[PDB]
Amino acid sequence: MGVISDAYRLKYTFGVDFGTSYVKYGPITLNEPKMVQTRGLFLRDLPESVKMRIPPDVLARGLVVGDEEVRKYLSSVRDVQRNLKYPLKDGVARRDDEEAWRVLKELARYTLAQFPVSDPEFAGWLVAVALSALAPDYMYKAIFDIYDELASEFKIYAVTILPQPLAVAIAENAVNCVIVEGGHGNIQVAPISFALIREGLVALNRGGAEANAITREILKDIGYSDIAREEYAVEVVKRAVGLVPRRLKEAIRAAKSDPDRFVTKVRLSPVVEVEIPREYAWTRFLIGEIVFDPNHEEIKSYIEQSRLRIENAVIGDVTLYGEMDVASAIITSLRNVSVEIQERVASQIILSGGAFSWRVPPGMEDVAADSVTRVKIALEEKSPALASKVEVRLVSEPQYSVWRGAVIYGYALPLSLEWSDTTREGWRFP
Amino acid sequence: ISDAYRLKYTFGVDFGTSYVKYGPITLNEPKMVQTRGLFLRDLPESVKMRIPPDVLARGLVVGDEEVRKYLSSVRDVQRNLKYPLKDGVARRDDEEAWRVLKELARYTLAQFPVSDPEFAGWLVAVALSALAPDYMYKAIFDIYDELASEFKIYAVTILPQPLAVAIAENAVNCVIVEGGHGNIQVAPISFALIREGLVALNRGGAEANAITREILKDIGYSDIAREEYAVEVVKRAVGLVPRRLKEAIRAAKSDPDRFVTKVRLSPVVEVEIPREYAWTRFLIGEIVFDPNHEEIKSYIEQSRLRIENAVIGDVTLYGEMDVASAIITSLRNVSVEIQERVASQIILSGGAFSWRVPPGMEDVAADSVTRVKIALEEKSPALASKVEVRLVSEPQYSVWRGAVIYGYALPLSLEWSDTTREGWRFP
Amino acid sequence: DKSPDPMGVISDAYRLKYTFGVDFGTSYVKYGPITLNEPKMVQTRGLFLRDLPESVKMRIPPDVLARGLVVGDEEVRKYLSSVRDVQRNLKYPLKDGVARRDDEEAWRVLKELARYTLAQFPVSDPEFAGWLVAVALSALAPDYMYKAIFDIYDELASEFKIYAVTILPQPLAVAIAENAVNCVIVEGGHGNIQVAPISFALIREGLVALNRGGAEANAITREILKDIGYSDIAREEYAVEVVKRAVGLVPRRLKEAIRAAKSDPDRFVTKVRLSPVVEVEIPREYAWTRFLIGEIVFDPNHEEIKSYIEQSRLRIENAVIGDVTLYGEMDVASAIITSLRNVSVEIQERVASQIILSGGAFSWRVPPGMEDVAADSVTRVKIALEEKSPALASKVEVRLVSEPQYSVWRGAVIYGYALPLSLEWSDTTREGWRFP
Amino acid sequence: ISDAYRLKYTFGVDFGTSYVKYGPITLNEPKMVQTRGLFLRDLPESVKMRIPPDVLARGLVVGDEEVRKYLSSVRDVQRNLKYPLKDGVARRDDEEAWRVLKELARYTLAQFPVSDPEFAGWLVAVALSALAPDYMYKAIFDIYDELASEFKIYAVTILPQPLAVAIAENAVNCVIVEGGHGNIQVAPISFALIREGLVALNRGGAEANAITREILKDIGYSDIAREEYAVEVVKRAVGLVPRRLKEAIRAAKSDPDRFVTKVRLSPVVEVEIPREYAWTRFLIGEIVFDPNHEEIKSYIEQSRLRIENAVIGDVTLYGEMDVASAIITSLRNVSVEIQERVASQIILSGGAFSWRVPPGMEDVAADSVTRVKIALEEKSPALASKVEVRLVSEPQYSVWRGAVIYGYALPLSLEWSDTTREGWRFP
Numbered sequence A: 001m002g003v004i005s006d007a008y009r010l011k012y013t014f015g016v017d018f019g020t021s022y023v024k025y026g027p028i029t030l031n032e033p034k035m036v037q038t039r040g041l042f043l044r045d046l047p048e049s050v051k052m053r054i055p056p057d058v059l060a061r062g063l064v065v066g067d068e069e070v071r072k073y074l075s076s077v078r079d080v081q082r083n084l085k086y087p088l089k090d091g092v093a094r095r096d097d098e099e100a101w102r103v104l105k106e107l108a109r110y111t112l113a114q115f116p117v118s119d120p121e122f123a124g125w126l127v128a129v130a131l132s133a134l135a136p137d138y139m140y141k142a143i144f145d146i147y148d149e150l151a152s153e154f155k156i157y158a159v160t161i162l163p164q165p166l167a168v169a170i171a172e173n174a175v176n177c178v179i180v181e182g183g184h185g186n187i188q189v190a191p192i193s194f195a196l197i198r199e200g201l202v203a204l205n206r207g208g209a210e211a212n213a214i215t216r217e218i219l220k221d222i223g224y225s226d227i228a229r230e231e232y233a234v235e236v237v238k239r240a241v242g243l244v245p246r247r248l249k250e251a252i253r254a255a256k257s258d259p260d261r262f263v264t265k266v267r268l269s270p271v272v273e274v275e276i277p278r279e280y281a282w283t284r285f286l287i288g289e290i291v292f293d294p295n296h297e298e299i300k301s302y303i304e305q306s307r308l309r310i311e312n313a314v315i316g317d318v319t320l321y322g323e324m325d326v327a328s329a330i331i332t333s334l335r336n337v338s339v340e341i342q343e344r345v346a347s348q349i350i351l352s353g354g355a356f357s358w359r360v361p362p363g364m365e366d367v368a369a370d371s372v373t374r375v376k377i378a379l380e381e382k383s384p385a386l387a388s389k390v391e392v393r394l395v396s397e398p399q400y401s402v403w404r405g406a407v408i409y410g411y412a413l414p415l416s417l418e419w420s421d422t423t424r425e426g427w428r429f430p
Numbered sequence B, D: 001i002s003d004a005y006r007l008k009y010t011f012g013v014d015f016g017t018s019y020v021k022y023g024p025i026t027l028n029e030p031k032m033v034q035t036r037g038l039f040l041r042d043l044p045e046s047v048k049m050r051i052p053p054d055v056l057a058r059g060l061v062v063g064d065e066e067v068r069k070y071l072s073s074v075r076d077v078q079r080n081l082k083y084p085l086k087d088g089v090a091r092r093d094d095e096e097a098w099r100v101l102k103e104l105a106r107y108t109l110a111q112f113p114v115s116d117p118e119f120a121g122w123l124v125a126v127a128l129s130a131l132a133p134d135y136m137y138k139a140i141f142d143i144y145d146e147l148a149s150e151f152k153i154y155a156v157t158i159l160p161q162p163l164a165v166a167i168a169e170n171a172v173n174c175v176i177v178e179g180g181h182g183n184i185q186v187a188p189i190s191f192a193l194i195r196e197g198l199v200a201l202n203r204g205g206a207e208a209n210a211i212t213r214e215i216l217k218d219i220g221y222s223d224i225a226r227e228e229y230a231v232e233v234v235k236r237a238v239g240l241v242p243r244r245l246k247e248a249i250r251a252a253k254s255d256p257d258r259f260v261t262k263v264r265l266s267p268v269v270e271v272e273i274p275r276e277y278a279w280t281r282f283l284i285g286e287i288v289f290d291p292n293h294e295e296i297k298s299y300i301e302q303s304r305l306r307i308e309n310a311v312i313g314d315v316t317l318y319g320e321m322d323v324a325s326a327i328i329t330s331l332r333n334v335s336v337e338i339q340e341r342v343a344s345q346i347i348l349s350g351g352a353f354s355w356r357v358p359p360g361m362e363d364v365a366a367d368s369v370t371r372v373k374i375a376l377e378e379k380s381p382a383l384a385s386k387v388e389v390r391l392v393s394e395p396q397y398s399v400w401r402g403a404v405i406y407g408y409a410l411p412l413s414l415e416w417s418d419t420t421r422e423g424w425r426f427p
Numbered sequence C: 001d002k003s004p005d006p007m008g009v010i011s012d013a014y015r016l017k018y019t020f021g022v023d024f025g026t027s028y029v030k031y032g033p034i035t036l037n038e039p040k041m042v043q044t045r046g047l048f049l050r051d052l053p054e055s056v057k058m059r060i061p062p063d064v065l066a067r068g069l070v071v072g073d074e075e076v077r078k079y080l081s082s083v084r085d086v087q088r089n090l091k092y093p094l095k096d097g098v099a100r101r102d103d104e105e106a107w108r109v110l111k112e113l114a115r116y117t118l119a120q121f122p123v124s125d126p127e128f129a130g131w132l133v134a135v136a137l138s139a140l141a142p143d144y145m146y147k148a149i150f151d152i153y154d155e156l157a158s159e160f161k162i163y164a165v166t167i168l169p170q171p172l173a174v175a176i177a178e179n180a181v182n183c184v185i186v187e188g189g190h191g192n193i194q195v196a197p198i199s200f201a202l203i204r205e206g207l208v209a210l211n212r213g214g215a216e217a218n219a220i221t222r223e224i225l226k227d228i229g230y231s232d233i234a235r236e237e238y239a240v241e242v243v244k245r246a247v248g249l250v251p252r253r254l255k256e257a258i259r260a261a262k263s264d265p266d267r268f269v270t271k272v273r274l275s276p277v278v279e280v281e282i283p284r285e286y287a288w289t290r291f292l293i294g295e296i297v298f299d300p301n302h303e304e305i306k307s308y309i310e311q312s313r314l315r316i317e318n319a320v321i322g323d324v325t326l327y328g329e330m331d332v333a334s335a336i337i338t339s340l341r342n343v344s345v346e347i348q349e350r351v352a353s354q355i356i357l358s359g360g361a362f363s364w365r366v367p368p369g370m371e372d373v374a375a376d377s378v379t380r381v382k383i384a385l386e387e388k389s390p391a392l393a394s395k396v397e398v399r400l401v402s403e404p405q406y407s408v409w410r411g412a413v414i415y416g417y418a419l420p421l422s423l424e425w426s427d428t429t430r431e432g433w434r435f436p
């Protein structure tokens, strides 16, 4: 308990945000966290002409993680659904799923392995893990076991674990507000008092994943239906082209009356280039809009053919509303909160997550919309009295915010407090 | 099974479209034999009577030195001289082609007699063309199976050629461009062969001869052109590949004296390239890479030369597509994520690409790699900058070197399976 | 006591006894059973008795006269002396390798020779079931010749037991006899030198014929003999032969041998006894012409030969026999090169490696102590090829057979022995047996 | 007509220069009569009156026995005892010679009369000289024509003597050398007479007498030497042929007593060769063979002996050419291929070659054939080794023997032709 020293924690606090598509990790001393994709590749179903040219210690593990490694063998994998496990498909990994847990463990390892013991005074990391706000108790328990088990491979002094929206709040120094985390698998809207107000939390079954889904189905209509089968390329495209409308109707007609302004080409490789033709330039606004509002006629046409799915999900007690739009997700959250504090909590709305990292192209500000803009005018429409009083901002680095928060939390939480299965906060020590 | 055993008795056999390369791993380079058999069914009795009785009993002879003996006196060349791998694949209802392949497999093994009193059978890795369909893989296995009751052959495996080239070159991510007699095949390699990416052209060393033949007639050597053997000797000695076809033509027309040449064909026959025709040397090499030029099309418009497509099962062989665009088309049919790394390495193999630059011609003459680099410069400059193009060291022997490496490294606890497309079979 | 073998005629033992060869040369037929050491010879010619006086007719056996024709050297000679006109009653049926079909007299003689030939060898064994006869004909012999020869031996079946007949080209026969599979046969006859390349069989496209041979060597010997002053003995064709055999030499180089024989004539003068009463001598002044006699066979383009052509006393000219042109002027070196050029390139290496000289026309020998100026047949061809294509001469090995007349025959028996009797002759396959 | 008939009624007549030999084929040997007639041109009346008037009417007598009776009382013998074939041939303008020949042809047939009633006429073969020109052949035919109306003669033919001697000796290829009184003819026989080969010498029996006459004058018997009959009797009895004239002359000059000899000319007269002249016996025989000796030329330098050339039709008769060189000249005028064989056989016919060696002289003296062997030994030794020289069986019956064989064998459907020169005439 001289390990308590703020100087030691100022160097040896280790943050890990387990995102639904990307883990952000690294020590507190970093300026921005290292990232790796949350997924692992099982090597059970690889041919022997591929097996024989792989390091013997690697095959022994049977599971491979980390961007540069997974990319290596991905090309020659017989069945992608059996061997490329995304353990956090939607924030949570069902408990009886030994494969999902093998990957999470293997990630937790790869993560720590990247930063080795240097100092002879180093007595173990203080690891602060950020889990989804939807994570059931078994997850917190399983994560502690993972880090416990891993303690015999790396010096891990102490482990703690906090929900994501709280991490965003901490990183922003935001007290009374509404945090809106936008991931790949889900958007979660939590009202923050000083910690998370559980009763207020509202989750939507929609995110970066649906933005890809439409971009894929648009790419089938344009006639690149071979490049649309490849998930990697879809993402590249969604990032490169997609726009978010101020109003969907006013942007669609503006891009049909003036297509040549909205056409665009994307270099995917030295040999393949993808182009959005004049005929389909209007669809760019669908890519971004679907994250915010899925209740549009040109989207439901994609649902009536079995090519796009907007629907609900249940993860434990939590219902994730597939259809509910972002403005009403906020309103619903504040309505689940006590009236006395609705006043305060509403003044501040914070957007975090990759799903909201949309930019506007120079000279498009008349129909193209910023993330904050699209939400401000969604709220103008939905509840006008709310909108006039409310200040909406997106954080500076939307993917890094959760991590920043974890390390700040892992530095501030006093080590005299032990984790308690009922209190849901404190430290475990292996 | 002992590593000491596999380091000595691993046997490779490359079934090429024109030459089979074979031999044990202990060789410095593989023995070669022309992929062809001579049937003696239709021979005069004044030729049959001079032949050893046991030989006639077979009715079929293989191996360069034997075929050459009786070849001269063959009534009809088309019925009795079988080149089974005309264009990489041997059709299933062709009992004659399979008889030759079988007989070749034997001649091949006969060359190296059981010496050790401990030798209990070869471990044999056969390399077939990448175009070989499932029946071919099976039929080659039967052939080696049947031949077990003749030679000690413990274990048999079988891999595609492009893959073998990759292995010998120790290249994991690459584009193999194999250039044979019947066809140039362009296959991208991830770790094993990427099936969807393979692109084949219906051009090869054969078309370089076809033009060399029609050139030889215009010079007025129309007796020497009817003879297939001599043409080859000529296309080898004289043919050149241009930096640019159009831009090398002007160079050999303004200074013909530098580009005139003679070839000794025999003690008594010498063929010479006139000053007036010296420029056509550049056609011989160019056709392999690019058949889309005015002076080639004139030969096609007369029924004397054939640039055309072919279908062999699933695959189309594009007669017209040039080598630069064949590569881009290959990378286009491959996964986008990995196009980057696969393209970084283009490897040239095969005889069709073993052109050299005659000392003092480097201004208009081009070796194979040079011609591919500048083919890509034209087509997509963005591609050319990221890519590194090289020809293998020994263009014919490369496929074989890989086969021996594969048959040595592949673990024997893996059994061949019709669905997995890899492993050993045991006779 | 055993039964006589019915599969008896096929048995190697029977064939090693009753295989009968007959080489129809343009000047001499060589014939005989395989059992012989060397073939009996007979001159290819018949003497008609139609035009003889009665004071000579009356002194001839009645059955001989009845025939009106005789063959066989010892016979023809007996009655030749007393024949009024030799040019019409002495037929040499194979004047130049072939006898044209519209010539009933030529075929009569050939038949009569075929008979005389077989008559010489009688039915001794009681097991003998018929001869197996293999006829060698010239390479120039067109299909009708193969036919007419078959009929001749067919008709002769009602006279002699002849089980089967076959018939092969002479160049091929030489190859077989010399056990040379890849080679160039250069047959030197009386009427013509034919140069045939052999792969396994004769390469048809390759054959080159020269309209020149033993005949031309006589022809110049005749005109030289006239220049010396022997115009009576020069008229007599028998005597010309005797002289050409005895005196003729082949020069290493014609120009250099003439100089040699002109500066030292007495070295090259020579005499020949023709009969107890006649001796011919090549005088000092003409001694150098001995070299023209041998040279003309190989190379007729020399000023001192052309002088006899410029006067109308010697004729070097081309000839046509069916498909084939016989080049009168072409020298032997160039006839060879020309031949190999008409051959496939892949085999030119091996075919040229072996050059074999057959025929009497190449039976020239060097009188010992003249090997500095004089040259034998091969030596002359070797230096012919050295000059013409030195690239060729280095790779090539040139030899004359042992018995240059006996070679064709020797091959024929080997062929007629080895050819399996299960094979029938076929007009298009051009090989096999005919049975009468 | 019939073979049985010709075996009985074939009639031969050899018209020799000195004796006609005659008779039918059925004889053992022919009857002989001397070729001469005695003209009774004028006789006193006391002599005419004692002669059968039939005899006078003719004025000419033939037959040895007749001539001898009247010769005693005939005025001038040189003018009246005519020898028609004095020299092989009888001149055309000579009415008397033809009168004798005719009368002989008659006497000849008169000797054998018509016995059988089936006799239909003789078949008569006359052998004339080889020098006999066309007119003789005709005139002999006429003679036998005219005589048809006196004796039954069915057919006449007429062949040269050399041919006959050949036929009789059964010699096919040979050189017949006919040795006459007036001339020696050398005719080569292939199957028939080779006319171009025939060589004639203007010498023989006549010159042997000429010298014998001139020797008898030197001995001093100049009355007996002017008489022609006496000279013959002497040359026959004394004359010898030398092995070598030089070596035999010295032999008889050193030893005269060995070579002296006496001869009865009649019951009343005897002649003696003195010691001093004994050597000349050798000149008598030698002149026949070789007249080129100094001791013969000595008689020519005085105008008392004559050696010279003569023409009989086409042929020149060489007075000086010796018998050895006559033979070589003949064979050189024959085709070369048959020179070998024609020379192999030399046959001597005629009286001029009827010399014998008196026993105990065979060291210096030589018979006819011996003289020719050593004559040919000297001249062409190459010839002498190959050739066999002999005298016929009966030196005078040979010609006839042949004539009967020829007249028996010649097919009777062949007619004589002035151009072909063989066949039968019928009257």
Ligand SMILES: Nc1ncnc2c1ncn2[C@@H]1O[C@H](COP(=O)(O)OP(=O)(O)O)[C@@H](O)[C@H]1O
Residues within 6 Å of the ligand: A018, A019, A020, A021, A022, A023, A182, A183, A184, A185, A207, A208, A209, A235, A238, A239, A352, A353, A354, A355, A356, A357, A358, A398, A399
């Ligand atoms: N520049 C961008 N434009 C649009 N979308 C982005 C961008 N960068 C990242 N994203 C999206 O954001 C998501 C990742 O955000 P993150 O907060 O890490 O969520 P997760 O918890 O799912 O990893 C991905 O679905 C990705 O497609």
Ligand SMILES: Nc1ncnc2c1ncn2[C@@H]1O[C@H](COP(=O)(O)OP(=O)(O)O)[C@@H](O)[C@H]1O
Residues within 6 Å of the ligand: B015, B016, B017, B018, B019, B020, B179, B180, B181, B182, B204, B205, B206, B235, B236, B349, B350, B351, B352, B353, B354, B355, B395, B396
């Ligand atoms: N030196 C050379 N120059 C040009 N072409 C060559 C050369 N050597 C061989 N070739 C060509 O290469 C082909 C044979 O090479 P290979 O790789 O064995 O082909 P395959 O795939 O038929 O076995 C032939 O068509 C021949 O024309």
Ligand SMILES: Nc1ncnc2c1ncn2[C@@H]1O[C@H](COP(=O)(O)OP(=O)(O)O)[C@@H](O)[C@H]1O
Residues within 6 Å of the ligand: C024, C025, C026, C027, C028, C029, C188, C189, C190, C191, C213, C214, C215, C244, C245, C358, C359, C360, C361, C362, C363, C364, C404, C405
């Ligand atoms: N010693 C020799 N010198 C030169 N030529 C000869 C010799 N002997 C024979 N001949 C020639 O050989 C020829 C006959 O032999 P051969 O080759 O069998 O010819 P053919 O086939 O016509 O019978 C004749 O032309 C003859 O001139």
Ligand SMILES: [Mg+2]
Residues within 6 Å of the ligand: A017, A018, A019, A020, A399, A402
């Ligand atoms: Mg996150």
